[model samples]
Target chain A: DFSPKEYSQKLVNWLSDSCMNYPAEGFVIGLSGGIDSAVAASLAVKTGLPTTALILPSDNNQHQDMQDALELIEMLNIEHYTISIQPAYEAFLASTQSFTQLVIKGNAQARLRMMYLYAYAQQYNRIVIGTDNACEWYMGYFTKFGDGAADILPLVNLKKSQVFELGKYLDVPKNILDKAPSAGLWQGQTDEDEMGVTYQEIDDFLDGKQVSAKALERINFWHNRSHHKRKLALTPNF
Target chain B: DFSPKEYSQKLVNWLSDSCMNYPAEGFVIGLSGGIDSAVAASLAVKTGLPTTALILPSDNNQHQDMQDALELIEMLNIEHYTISIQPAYEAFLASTQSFTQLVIKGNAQARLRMMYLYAYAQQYNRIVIGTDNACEWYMGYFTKFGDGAADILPLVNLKKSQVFELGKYLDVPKNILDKAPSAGLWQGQTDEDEMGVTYQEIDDFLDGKQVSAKALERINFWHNRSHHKRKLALTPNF
Candidate 1:
């Protein structure tokens, strides 16, 4: 459903305007070796502005995940760097004295990754580009200040199916498309496994198509519960 | 001219009704052992809802400052917990293997503290309360996603002087009032030391009072430099 050329031009112009109108030097993107970030990196390079892609993998299953992230950078022939989040992740686990649960540690890795991205952005005078799509955005399937914290989000308007389409047109590598969607928060952590609902059904619900009652109910639960994440902190008006 | 009694009632109502309208269970405040959080905890207790206080001191110098935080908790008779952020802080320092600079690590400790606070909020259904005041906020002297990532901010509208006044009206205790304001990110880290301008001068500028050009310039530099920390991430139209 997405015309890659038309959509990309619009996105590139928007991203460029973000750089040109604002006094920023370049763009920074975190490459998670996934389709979403691959497609985002694809668009980021099109702006013809300097773009820095960072490969950030924690200690869990580091080899396979880190390699996939590298494949995209080489395939695109973009400037890149690798900063392992493993030490910070392990340090958080060790330092917290085992008070942290698996799920909490997973999120800590994510926030730690984002902290590095922001630090890079500040050091290089670049804005961090967001890779989240409509499904993840709507379902609030993001760490509030981790993946949720970005300068400008490009893929936020498109659904996952739409993103897959754009990725095809953009020639995102086969390995990325073939792999299971995961935040890579930890080992064997797939997006569907975490959400307990597949993107296919979630996208179906977003499309207003008939879905399982269980699916719709679960979707509503996330949307309602994560209402706070969809906005800034509440401030009272006097 | 801030009537402590009048302002407290307004603030208490604002905080209480958030829970009433939003279906949240209670409130959680991170005690930095400072005026703003002490005042915030004082107001949170006024809501008559279950209020929890947390003291998160990273290992840099855990002893003396943590005691001050404990005093307020005991003095107020509120439920509280003390979790040394040191282990995690050290783990991060060790794990990052010295990649993190002094300043970056300061923010890492900040984000770690916030991550724990949110974990507690999610566990207990309480919203993490913010301790930022007008001066800190306007100057953007906050670690994004760290101190900046609270559910609702009670002191956001009031300046430092105003918060000091509120602290007095609320019987915030002399030690809290007497102690110098610090994020306690690391040893010897005072707010004024980092900001390079005194709160008094910043407050004078906020109040439209005539101040030295140097003070006004530094304040503006901070305010504009931290423009992004003041809002939610950007999303594109269409």
Candidate 2:
């Protein structure tokens, strides 16, 4: 039932309306040479403008992933640029003293990427197009002030299955599509592994379908727990 | 300056212990005969057990507000009861339908009570509270559902002059210390007009100091734009 042609058109419409409604000149995303970016670049190209992709590689980010990202961008014929963060990343860590820190260091890297995006936006007079799919936002799976930053989200409302469907419709490379999705922010880090839940379960929940009661319980538990994070910085009048 | 005597001690300590590190029991707010209850009745009470409030109208919510909350038993109060809406308000509206057929209606008069809070949370076995306060949350400001809906808020947050001082104090009242501070849900009604924007502008722009250009801009623009609405609700994920 997930049709790529319709989905892509809908996404294009949403992207158009999102930028129009929010009032932004152009869009940008930090490409990690990953499938999400590959697919996103395709969608960006369809937006009928110079959609820019920045390959901001850090110490832990893979060279292979960067190469793969470059190949995908070239295949998609998207106008692209690269801005490596090796110097910034090292300098930030040196200033922060994170020898034993776990999440903070990784979060810093994500924030560094956002700083780069903000700088790019200032230079290019464009909006930072967030790459967060619905699945990640639902689970609160991103860093708070880091990769979680975005002026407007293009594919935020799509489920993972829908994302794959749109990707196939866009003729994304099979290798990128078939490979398991990962942020690849660090060694041996798979999103599902870190989350301790499969994307299948998340997709089932997102489709307005019933997940297993146990799965539902766990899912609702997280949803209810993280409700605060999804809210305004403070309590509202209503 | 975070002093211990800043605000309600029990609530701040309880919240920090219960929610910050882990989750715990429900919260409490109250509905009042005056404008202050409007704030407590709605928002802060939900913090603990999915939000609960009360409407304790000694004078039928009409003299001040209408439809006193049905007495119920829960934690430290009447456990429960029920109040029907349709049969009561529909007949009244039949008589009072205006020449323009734009009857404001009375089920609103009844729902204006905390019965919704009772009925909805009944299935979940949650509590209800109320909203009432001093100058900031009150001073005769607050609207139904805009402020009048709660399980239990015990008049602990409002102060004669320092509603904003409680902004970060971590207390029963501090939960709403940062809001745009309106109470009217009716058309063309505004809190700033009534209060002269003195306290709110002082709190927002000055950041409790001598107002600066940046703070003035924040107060004048951000609060003006928000007009005391709740946070933006992204399309619900999952």
Candidate 3:
């Protein structure tokens, strides 16, 4: 018996119950076909309420995403819709003629998708659901206000391995569960590739296991600087 | 004519249109009906796209918020939804089990609101609108997530006085335009009440007039520490 799986269940049960207590009538979950969201959505649905899944397909061909999203929805029998952002995505490229930077380009897409998510939440009277797991949340792997954004987060406590375990328990799409994880923001992007470290390594460190001091320092730097993302708008009076 | 109004308008118009020219689709403005949010929403609407106003009415009720929120909604006719978080707010208080620790209790509410805003954005497909004027943004005066969270900010350049001027130009409700500003997170809480200095003087100091070494040092200290808010997430893996 894996203790991690039991820990995941304990966390999920607490989170699912917490979700039941929010003010919104239902949740609008952004189904990325990722393990995180799949686990989060399943818990959300299991807690007993309506959940609308918004499949935000962006620039990445991301064949695995569609397969994963469809599988999760079918497994949970949750109502879902797909919004292809190719129009807005292409329009952004055609107009933003300044080709000097990539950060500038990435931010544009992140900001665009954020806008769309808020608007739909307004129309449906639903709270925007967030799917950040604890490891990525602590490590700052997810984009701030982009993927890191949400109204209610169902899985902010579980670690990466715990998320996979929860996903397995929830029976998320096999292809997605089997596939390599990616943010799908750019061409063939994977979290590990961008992060320059493995999830297992980071998770080990966060859980208080022994890791190299350099790895811990790198992660600590992120925890400190990126700590701002973990804050509310600072209301400093002079 | 107030120069501050013109100044804020110049920046707002530029950011709003510039973001869209990245062909960014409109903004999801979190309208607090305070001078900053009111001005920001007006300028965002001035760009002529449908701006969704997310009115997150938490347990902490200031005197003017209800009237101001209603008035701004009426004046601008901006599409808005009111989410009363009494139940969840109470749940937080209950969970804390402390009437004595009101400060922590209050912070939990602010964080809860930030969570909701992020979720709303994901569902509606809108950027989490930020309403930090330069005065607050520079000083770190907003909650990290509550008031501080936003995907695309429209009013980061405006000072407090400048925001008021923008409000005047945008024809924001008279009371909101005229009243003293507060975060509305607590009773008897006006921003100026907490800050020893007024924004009018701070803006003057920020304008780079050669100040006494002591005062200049303090200002620079705040500027440096708080400057982290304007940073990118994670690292370049350098």
Candidate 4:
């Protein structure tokens, strides 16, 4: 039932309509070394709008993925910006002087990257293209108000495996496709390592295949806790 | 019909219900030395849940307002944290290497402050209480996903003048009540100066009272442009 080529065309059409509706001058995407971002960036470029891909490396960025991202940018032949986010991340840490938690600091990094993307979006009159997949969305793997805040999410409905397939169809870099997923928030932080479950289990569960009880428990817990992130902030009706 | 005392009591009760419903252990509010935040923080404090006030001053913080905010925190006798956000702001600027617009940088400031607040909320098991009054809410005056992003908006339903009344009822400092409203995104930035319409006109318009034609037009313009900010991002059903 799923067709990568067909879905790619559909995404392109959807992006066109969205740009016209928002009247955005172009599209801006943060190209992480992850497959999701590479796939999303490719789709955004396919939209025929002026697309800018930014490779933002904060502290703890992996060199392999950075090279993969650079290779993808070269292959796509689109406008790109490589920004080192370490200075800003350090500055925020120094300013706060109290952020000790790794997760919170990671969230700060994500938010800072978003701030940079939005700054570019405003300057270029472009809309931000989010790269969250259904697996991350269902499990709430992304940081709230950080990566979760985007002007448009073009890949939310797709599963991780599905995105990989689409990435293949779109001719994303081979190494990027084969690499493990990571938010690049901290040292050696992979999605599977942090989530305590692999995307394989998530995809199987979503496809009605059986998964471990522990995996199910973790998925349910994160989904319930992060439901608030999926909607607007609750306000009193009165 | 709108009694400040009655409204204050009602707000306290509502806040109690909300905290109970959310199962939050405390409240975290960013104190800006403006009437809206002062009123919201006071109400949050009145709920009897432990409340922490944060003074996050980035570049261009007005010293007068900083003192006013400190006095309010002292008067309330609450836990508070004061952090300089300049280091982070400058870092983000340096990382981006090209953000030049005042409004975008100002938005960056608002969002950075929020990142700091949410960091505390996560650490303290509290909810983020927003300080946007109806004037800012209806006019879309605040930054999207910046100051606009909060766990709960306690004062969105109240107009600017009504917030002033509530401030009076709550014994908010006289100087704070009398000072011009500002987002403090830039030096000498006042709410009226940025919106080009005074709070008096906004309140009157909201209450179905007559306002100048130009005031009405300006209000409508921003409200329409920022409609997306007031809601979740639009997506295609497919």
Candidate 5:
């Protein structure tokens, strides 16, 4: 019922048109070694506008993630930089080691990468491109003001499974396509482990398909818990 | 002609009520040694909910800023910590110094403080209290996701002048009240220096009074340019 080419042309053209209205020279995205970023990276390049990709690898990042990111950067033939946020992260960890928990450290890590991307974006005169999808957006599976802050978001209207489909059309490397999704928070942490429900179930629920009660409860749990991520911070109207 | 008492009680009550609704224990704000943070710091303690204040001084910070922060923390009689974001920031600078500029480094400094605030917020179960005022909001003077991201904004609806007035009622120290406002980006960096327009002019414009054409244009320029700070990231409506 859909065509990736139709989606591809629409996405690429929209990105080009979006660029005309901004003061930025082009776009930048932190390549996360995931299909979502691969598709966004590819689309950013497809616009033929200047796009810079930052392969930000932290101490907690797996070797495979960085390798997959390098593969796609070469495939797209775009200008990129491999900036290691490890030193900055270790510096953060060293200063804060006594005070923070694992979850806090993870959030700091996500925000640290954002600092690098934004620092580069500021110096390079580019807008940060967010690579979130419909399923993740609805579930709020993002670090607020971390990955959540971006100028233009591609694949936001598409489902997770659909992102993979578009990835095929965009020629995203097969390694990323087959890779398990992770925000790359910890060594072996997978997105599914953190998200009580699978992408297929959330996609189905969003698509108005029925699911078991347990799945519905879990999906609703995150949706409601993370509702703050989806809206502006509360301000007293007075 | 609105009563300051009326505003203070309403703000404090709303904050107390909002806390009950969330999972967090209390609130935290990184004191920037300005009336905005002073007002927020004083209010957080008024609720009698274990408020924690951080005097996050960076290398670029002036001695006066840290002194003002310490003065208010003691005045409020709340739990406070003086955390230097220097080591982490220098670590960031050591790595990014090659490709970055002054503006980018300033933004990184702001974001680094945010990372610290959020890390502590996550660990301490406190919501981040943003201290931005209506004048700054209209002028878009904050670094997006740097000073802009917070769980609750106390003075978002108040003008800069109004915040200072509220500060007096909150018993905000005279040092902060008399001090020139700065985000503490660099030594001797006052907010008005970067603003191109003075707070009085912006406050007057916001209050429906007339300002010079230059003031209006410059105000509108930043307001339009930094509109991204005021809203959620754009997604294709599709």
Candidate 6:
């Protein structure tokens, strides 16, 4: 019961007003060759503002994702930049001589990308747009201070299914639509792979529809753990 | 009319309750040799939990501040880690060939520190605590997604002056209490220097007291520009 055309128009209007309200020169987004960024970029471009996308590839980032992200940039005909975060990533890794988990490394990559986006945003006087959808938020699937940091989030409330619907209406390329959703933090990593539950199940759970007990258990666990991510730091009410 | 003794007791209880409820193994804080972190770390330690303080120094970090942080760690006898972020910082500078303003570089440093904190938190099963106070929130002074990212914000409601009072009661070293406040984003940078108004003035304005025209202008400017930092990303109601 989601209407892409209506949603698209409403977002465009909102984006326009937000730009005027914030009075930023334009918008910048990091394109990860996933549905979330692709759909977010499309909606951003529709705002008729100066929109730019960055295709940031790290050492272990998927080549398929890079190709798909590039194709989206060309298809949209929007301004974009391609930068590799490998050098910085390696620098951080080499600087510290401690045993670290792959999860932590992936988080660093995200925060690194965010730093780049903010750098460009500052130079160009634009706002950084976030690509997270509702499913990611509900499950706290995204990194807290890493990719979770953005000037404005455009696709936050849309569920995975709703985003797919919106992407179709936006005419995002078929290849991007068909590709699996991934943060592209590590090699061969997919969103569902890390979350352990598919987006479909997550979406159903968020919509208050029937879901398996295991799915609900996993969903609730993450939601509670990441509750702090959705708001300002927990301060004493005093 | 803030009573440091009463405030301190309430915070300790709140922190204890939060820790028990969330069930993190411990709490991790980045000790920046500033009043904010000094106060925050002391409170975290008082929770009688496994509180660890990280003395993270970059290339431009001041020796005086490092001494203060070291002394604080020693006095508290809390588990501590000393790490230098310069290597990663230099790598980022080398990777980006373009000219970058100081502000962007500063934000990168904050995000990098956060990445390290989360890394340790994940490994130790602890929570990363943020050190922002209400004044920073009012002015949006802290970096978005950078220092702003935290698992729990224990100092969110306190004003800068109130924090100083609490710090006194907590017996935070006089050197730390007396030193000028700085984000340490760069050498010779002070919070009041950047804001162009003292925290005393900022606090007064936040308390609805009369402030000079210049003070009000600067305060309102940052508040409006960084409004997005205070809330979740904007999305269409539908």
User: Which candidate wins on lDDT?
Assistant: 4
Candidate 1 lDDT by residue in tens digits, A1-238? 4587788788889889877766688888999888899888888888889898888776675477678888888887887878777766665556545323566666677777777677777667788888889888888988777788788899998888878887888888888888888877667779887777888888888888888887788788788778888888888786
| Top candidate, metric DockQ | 5
> What range of 10 consecutive residues in model 4 chain A has the weakest lDDT sum?
A91-100
The digit string of per-residue lDDT tens for model 2 on A1-238 reads 5577876776666666665554556677788765666766787678775577778787787777778788777886765666666665554344322111455556656765665565555455566777777788788777543566566566677777777877788887777777777777777678777666677888889988777876776666666655534433222121
lDDT of 3 at B94: 40
Model 4 clash pairs are none
Per-residue error for B56 in candidate 3, Å, reads 24
* Whole-model alpha-carbon lDDT for candidate 1: 0.81
Worst 10 residues of 1 chain B by lDDT: B91-100
Ranking by TM-score: 5, 4, 6, 1, 2, 3
Across B9-51, the per-residue lDDT of candidate 3 in tens digits comes to: 5655675665565334666766666788787777777777657
User: Candidate 5, residues A103-214: lDDT per residue as tens digits?
Assistant: 7767777898788788888887888999889988999988888888888997899989899999998888888999888888788788878887888998899899998898
lDDT of 6 by residue, B86-105 (tens): 88887876665553478877
TM-score, structure 1 vs. true: 0.89
Error of 6 at A173 (Å): 2.2
Query: Which runs in model 3 stand beyond 4 Å of their true positions?
Result: A1-17, A93-100, B1-238
**Candidate 5 segments exceeding 4 Å error:** A97-100
Q: Between the candidate structures 1 and 6, which one is better when assessed by TM-score?
A: 6
Cα misplacement distance, residue A110 of candidate 3 (Å): 3.1
Off by over 4 Å in 4: A98-100, A186-188, A207-209, B98-100
Give the alpha carbon lDDT tens digit for every residue of A1-238 in model 3.
3354565556546555544554456667777777787777887776566677767676664866877798778878887767665655454344323211444445444544554454555455566667777778887766566666666666676668877877777677777677667777766788777666677878888688987777777788767656646754322222
lDDT, residue A92, candidate 4: 73
Q: Show model 2 residue runs off by greater than 4 Å.
A: A98-100, A208-225, A236-238, B1-238
Write the number of the candidate with greater lDDT, choosing between 2 and 3: 3
Output the lDDT of residue B53, model 3: 74
Q: What lDDT score goes with residue A69 in model 6?
A: 88
Candidate 1 lDDT over B1-238, as tens digits, reads 6788999999999999997676788998888777988999999999999899988876665476677778888888988877877666665555443223566777777888887777777667788898889999999988888888888999998879889989989888787787778877667778888888899999998889988888888898999878878976667786
Docking category of candidate 4:
medium
